[PDB]
Amino acid sequence: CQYKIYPPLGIARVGNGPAIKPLSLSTPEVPWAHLYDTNVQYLVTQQELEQLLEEAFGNVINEISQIKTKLFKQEEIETITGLLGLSHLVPQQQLSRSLDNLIVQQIKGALLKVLSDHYLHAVKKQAQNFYIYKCDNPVEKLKLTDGDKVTWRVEVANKKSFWYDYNNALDLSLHTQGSGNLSKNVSKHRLAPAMTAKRRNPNVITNSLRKQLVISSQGSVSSDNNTQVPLRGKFPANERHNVLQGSIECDNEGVLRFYAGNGISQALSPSSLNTDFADNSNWFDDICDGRVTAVVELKNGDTFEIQDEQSSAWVATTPPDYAPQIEPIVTMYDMVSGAALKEQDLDNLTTQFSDVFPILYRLYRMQWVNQADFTDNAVNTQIRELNSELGFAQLLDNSASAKSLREGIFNQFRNPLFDQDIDVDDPNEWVSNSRIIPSKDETNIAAKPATSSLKLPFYPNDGIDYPGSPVQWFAIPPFMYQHLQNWAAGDFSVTQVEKESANTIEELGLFYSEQFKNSPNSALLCARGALDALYGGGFHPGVELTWPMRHNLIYSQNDYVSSVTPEINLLGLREFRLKQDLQGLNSPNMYQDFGHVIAVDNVTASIDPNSDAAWLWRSTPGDLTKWMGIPWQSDAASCQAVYTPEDFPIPSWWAANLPVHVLPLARYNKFKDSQSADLPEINGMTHSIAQGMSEETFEHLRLEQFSQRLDWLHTADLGFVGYAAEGGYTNGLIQMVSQWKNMAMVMARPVENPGSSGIPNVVYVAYSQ
Amino acid sequence: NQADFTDNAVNTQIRELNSELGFAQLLDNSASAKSLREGIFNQFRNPLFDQDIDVDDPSNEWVSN
Numbered sequence: 147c148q149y150k151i152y153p154p155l156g157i158a159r160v161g162n163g164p165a166i167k168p169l170s171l172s173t174p175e176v177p178w179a180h181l182y183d184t185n186v187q188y189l190v191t192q193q194e195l196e197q198l199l200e201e202a203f204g205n206v207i208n209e210i211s212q213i214k215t216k217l218f219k220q221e222e223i224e225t226i227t228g229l230l231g232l233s234h235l236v237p238q239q240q241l242s243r244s245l246d247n248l249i250v251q252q253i254k255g256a257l258l259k260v261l262s263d264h265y266l267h268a269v270k271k272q273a274q275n276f277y278i279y280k281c282d283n284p285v286e287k288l289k290l291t292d293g294d295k296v297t298w299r300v301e302v303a304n305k306k307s308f309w310y311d312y313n314n315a316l317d318l319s320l321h322t323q324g325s326g327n328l329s330k331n332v333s334k335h336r337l338a339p340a341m342t343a344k345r346r347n348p349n350v351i352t353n354s355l356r357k358q359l360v361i362s363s364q365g366s367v368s369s370d371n372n373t374q375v376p377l378r379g380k381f382p383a384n385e386r387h388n389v390l391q392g393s394i395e396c397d398n399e400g401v402l403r404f405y406a407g408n409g410i411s412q413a414l415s416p417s418s419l420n421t422d423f424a425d426n427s428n429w430f431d432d433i434c435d436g437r438v439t440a441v442v443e444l445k446n447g448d449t450f451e452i453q454d455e456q457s458s459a460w461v462a463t464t465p466p467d468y469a470p471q472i473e474p475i476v477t478m479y480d481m482v483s484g485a486a487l488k489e490q491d492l493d494n495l496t497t498q499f500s501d502v503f504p505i506l507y508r509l510y511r512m513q514w515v516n517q518a519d520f521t522d523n524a525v526n527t528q529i530r531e532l533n534s535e536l537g538f539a540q541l542l543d544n545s546a547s548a549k550s551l552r553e554g555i556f557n558q559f560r561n562p563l564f565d566q567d568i569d570v571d572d573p574n575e576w577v578s579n580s581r582i583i584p585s586k587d588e589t590n591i592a593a594k595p596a597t598s599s600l601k602l603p604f605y606p607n608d609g610i611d612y613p614g615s616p617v618q619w620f621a622i623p624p625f626m627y628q629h630l631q632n633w634a635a636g637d638f639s640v641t642q643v644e645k646e647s648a649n650t651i652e653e654l655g656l657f658y659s660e661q662f663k664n665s666p667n668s669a670l671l672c673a674r675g676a677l678d679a680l681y682g683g684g685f686h687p688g689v690e691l692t693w694p695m696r697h698n699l700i701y702s703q704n705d706y707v708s709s710v711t712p713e714i715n716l717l718g719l720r721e722f723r724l725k726q727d728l729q730g731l732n733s734p735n736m737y738q739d740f741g742h743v744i745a746v747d748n749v750t751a752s753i754d755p756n757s758d759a760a761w762l763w764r765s766t767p768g769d770l771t772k773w774m775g776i777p778w779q780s781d782a783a784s785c786q787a788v789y790t791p792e793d794f795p796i797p798s799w800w801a802a803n804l805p806v807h808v809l810p811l812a813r814y815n816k817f818k819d820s821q822s823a824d825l826p827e828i829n830g831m832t833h834s835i836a837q838g839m840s841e842e843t844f845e846h847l848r849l850e851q852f853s854q855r856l857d858w859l860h861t862a863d864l865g866f867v868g869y870a871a872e873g874g875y876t877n878g879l880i881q882m883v884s885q886w887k888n889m890a891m892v893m894a895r896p897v898e899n900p901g902s903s904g905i906p907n908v909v910y911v912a913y914s915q
Numbered sequence: 916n917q918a919d920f921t922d923n924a925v926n927t928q929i930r931e932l933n934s935e936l937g938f939a940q941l942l943d944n945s946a947s948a949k950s951l952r953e954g955i956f957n958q959f960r961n962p963l964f965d966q967d968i969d970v971d972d973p974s975n976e977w978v979s980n
């Protein structure tokens with residue numbers, strides 16, 4: 147092995163912001179890098195656009211005054227147009243049309259308003275950088291000397307419209323001995339049976355014609371030329387719509403940058419409405435995923451092909467992350483780690499405190515995107531109590547005097563064995579005696595009173611379809627619940643250096659974030675950062691990817707490498723690679739399926755890598771995302787709260803990436819100021835009223851404003867606006883196709899002088915119109 | 916059912932026979948009546964479900980034509 151690509155699985159997220167570096171974001175390459183960064187701009191700002199324009203006006207001024215005095219005309223027009231390299235951001239004529247209708251300041255002002263209509267407040271694209279690392283096992287990024295060149299290739303596809311309905315995760319009925327991600331109890335006791343699933347777009351018959359339902363494109367860029375190349379397909383493939391699946395550029399140092407599409411979903415007819423959460427015929431979106439390879443050409447003639455599955459990479463595109471600094475409690479990098487573990491080996495797992503802190507830390511931070519974790523979570527309140535007395539470090543104590551404290555917390559978490567809080571129906575059905583989540587199909591018979599408390603966390607899960615099944619609700623996976631169980635029993639290790647930085651949960655998080663920043667394994671951190679912001683459960687189907695990712699069968703390699711720090715694990719770093727069909731879009735299995743339906747029996751038959759059904763795991767382009775909802779906006783609109791007859795806690799699906807209850811800019815502007823602020827308006831009050839009231843009442847008002855959380859579905863018009871509006875679930879799905887780009891985007895923001903109010907110095911604020 | 920009134924060729928052929936008082940040829944098992952019996956028989960769907968199909972990429976799938 148000579149050279150490798152990192153990350154092994156790259157992620158790029160759709161956005162209506164442009165595909166240029168100054169106005170786009172980059173997938174995290176180091177976990178926890180910017181959790182408290184109050185300068186983040188995830189939407190396109192006026193200042194960014196203004197900056198971008200003067201850089202085009204940075205020359206131009208000499209040239210326009212030269213025909214200023216030579217007096218517009220249609221090619222006065224074009225000489226002005228040509229020198230502002232802006233035709234890659236807005237169409238030709240929109241620029242010209244805005245000029246023929248009307249002093250340098252009035253071409254700027256006219257042009258600025260064009261970029262502002264297109265891009266102001268636009269959801270920035272989250273692009274993925276890919277790097278070549280020299281090997282011995284990675285040591286260092288490839289460094290091009292003159293004469294050296296790298297050539298990247300990327301082939302992507304979308305098969306959602308070709309694939310099968312998503313009713314629930316087929317692996318729920320897969321016979322297994324159990325993994326780190328999924329206990330054998332689910333299948334063996336039939337807690338959430340996999341359903342059969344029919345074909346999407348079932349009126350397209352014969353494999354030959356169904357090939358039209360698959361969108362695909364490809365392209366190559368080298369280090370000799372940084373011109374951006376689009377990845378443009380057609381639906382249906384070869385009336386007919388172009389689909390920008392992404393774009394790719396490569397800089398002189400050899401870094402590939404991959405931009406996802408614009409977020410465009412569309413039906414073939416306007417009357418075809420996306421009223422189901424996942425399976426809507428006649429629809430296509432611009433989500434893709436596919437195979438990333440490269441070729442390295444040194445000047446001494448030598449050439450190294452980066453093509454095999456150990457060395458090359460994959461890219462998937464996904465919905466946007468509406469709260470980039472709020473991390474899911476269980477992440478896709480956790481599914482990778484769990485997949486390499488066998489359930490009956492968890493007794494040999496060793497536990498440091500840095501392996502359980504992510505669970506408590508991520509759950510604690512869910513308060514900014516989900517009401518239940520802000521006002522109805524007894525463990526997050528216990529953490530606040532410890533913070534308020536600088537006594538968070540007792541959670542790091544593994545001795546007997548702290549066992550009552552650890553155990554009290556651990557006992558509130560749901561056991562992924564799904565064998566607690568159940569009455570066994572006369573032996574063999576497992577029926578929960580905790581709070582169930584009813585079906586919308588009501589039955590006017592008295593509910594059975596619950597006898598056991600509702601465990602944590604309060605999120606729905608793979609088995610939602612089945613009222614009373616313990617798998618309705620989410621549990622941290624087997625290996626992560628094992629870490630938490632060892633912690634509660636005392637069987638864990640932790641360093642004095644950790645203890646000294648552990649007076650509050652924020653201080654320890656900052657400390658651990660520094661351990662990531664200085665760990666010398668950039669190739670493996672980049673591989674883990676790509677996946678640590680993605681969700682890892684529940685899968686119904688989820689947000690970015692779904693249940694195949696939690697099986698080792700999808701990886702050609704999955705190995706523990708090292709801890710993050712020699713003394714600090716932090717759930718570790720791994721070297722993993724997806725299984726790949728090396729023929730790519732030319733694979734003979736590109737267009738394979740299981741006939742009229744897919745069922746767990748097909749999955750069972752795919753376990754054997756020699757069998758005829760093993761292609762399921764050997765990915766061709768489009769295989770990772772084809773499972774998800776078509777269009778994704780129907781999925782996102784479906785991904786919110788699931789109300790129970792009991793008001794609280796409100797259950798939520800995936801609040802860390804698709805938030806449910808957020809803190810809007812409106813409220814931020816009403817608590818961010820102090821009473822002493824030198825502003826004519828203070829927290830939405832006149833100066834005089836703000837400073838006339840007592841300090842007690844002022845801070846109280848701040849805290850009340852801070853406490854107001856707004857349904858995220860209400861941050862744009864999803865069908866509830868206007869007199870007599872219907873609103874409702876279905877209109878949400880329909881409207882999200884256009885409104886996804888207007889939904890609130892959560893960003894860290896400062897509170898310089900919280901005083902006595904109880905508002906932290908960093909708050910997470912939802913920005914929308 | 917309308918299709919059996921105005922769109923069923925076998926009902927119509929029965930009509931033709933009835934109109935000539937010639938329905939008894941259907942009870943003829945001889946060779947001279949074979950074409951007539953076959954003509955009605957070949958219009959019926961076969962419950963083997965293996966006619967009027969194209970085998971898609973034989974794993975094999977039966978797709979009606």
Ligand SMILES: [Mg+2]
Binds near residue numbers: 469
């Ligand atoms: Mg997030």
